[PDB]
Symmetry: C3
Subunit: 179 residues, 3 copies
Amino acid sequence: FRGYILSVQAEEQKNYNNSLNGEVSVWVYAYYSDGSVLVINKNSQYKVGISETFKAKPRAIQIIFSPSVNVRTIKMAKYLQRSHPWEATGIKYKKIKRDGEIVGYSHYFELPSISLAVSGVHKNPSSYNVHNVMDVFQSCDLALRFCNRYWAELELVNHYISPNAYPYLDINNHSYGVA
Amino acid sequence: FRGYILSVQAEEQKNYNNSLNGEVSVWVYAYYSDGSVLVINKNSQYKVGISETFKAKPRAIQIIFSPSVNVRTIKMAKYLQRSHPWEATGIKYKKIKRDGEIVGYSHYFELPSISLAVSGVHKNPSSYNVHNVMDVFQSCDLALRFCNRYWAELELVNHYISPNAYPYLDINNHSYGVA
Amino acid sequence: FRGYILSVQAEEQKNYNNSLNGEVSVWVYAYYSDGSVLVINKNSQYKVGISETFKAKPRAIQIIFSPSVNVRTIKMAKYLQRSHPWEATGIKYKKIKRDGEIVGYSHYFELPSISLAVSGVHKNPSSYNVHNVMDVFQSCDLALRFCNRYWAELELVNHYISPNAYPYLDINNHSYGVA
């Protein structure tokens, strides 16, 4: 029956993504004073991060991870003689839910130009058991990065979030994603 | 005799390049609809990769590795919930030969803008025996990248491929390189 | 007494920076033929590097590391079949001193456009004891990079070096930094 096969094939996808061959994804949304939105997305195996400068106008930031991330591994960096190299910010991430299922994890914060870097490791319990180290080194080379700008959030939502089934939270706290 | 010394000095160079202090090199050629060619070259120790977006016009791609690469380690990446993090494409690479000697390895494919990443590890049998891991981390910092554009393939061949002794295959399937 | 607490708090800062949670910093200064200066700064944990091309006019280079670097780990890269992947240049670095204390390490050299990469590892004796390898991989993602251009060295010194307490050596061999 075409109802039963569809259901098991969803359970296979979950097991694949939660294996160490599943990707970890991160998005960084920079909300600008003219109402436009810049989004940087990176996807990779084993671990993933973004490091960028948001120059001129940016007013707030939202960082979204795929559900494969281990929230406790998330780290973020933002006088040189007296500063810590990162903060562990996982406790500030909110679950994005769709039909009861976690589709992502969101950290939104307002800015008082900023340089920002964020990093997270795949959930799999084998992650801190370094598969060979050289496989992780190759994953750093194979990571794909995407960057584009949208005129307003409505346009980002209808032509970037919705058509690609990405997880998201908009200004009205409406949540997006596919369970 | 100046004939004998020249020959042994070639055997020393082979042994050096096939040691773990030899570089791995990669080139990515993007062939555009106006007949121009964009080339990105990266050279590094232990392993090497490229990750770029080719935006506007690009019609085909050729990826060339130096003979120090282990062809079986080559990996290439090109809905998020349902995609594999890379394909192992080494079996698609063709040997480039000059006077009977492998001067490079070539994967050419036509496109139906693309984002693309490719990665390969040095041939040396010690590669999967991680020298210290910190030496490999430094190699990631020391990798040098070069990018330029040429008006036509003839110009790339005469002012980039030939003067630098690089391996290549042109549109007429003529092979270049120095044995 | 407010004199005693200030002194011990300096000894704590030294111990922190010389721990593996202290940052390693690197600056690359490119001196151009119009008297302007381009500076690239990167800061990170465990290790740090820069890899850039300085295109059009550049006439000399100065590379400055924070005192947390292990000078013997410094490496620099600048026909493909016959070149070494880096040189260990630590012996060319000069100590920058302020009130008897090392505030940095400087390698200045004149050029005869250049592509250049430099890499150094934190001093801590535990550095070659890979904390988990995945922590070092995350440090690569969290590294922050800064780049700007100044009209003349006097402006770089008064609006970049002095206000940020960075170590430096100017054209008159005057040294800057905070002990």
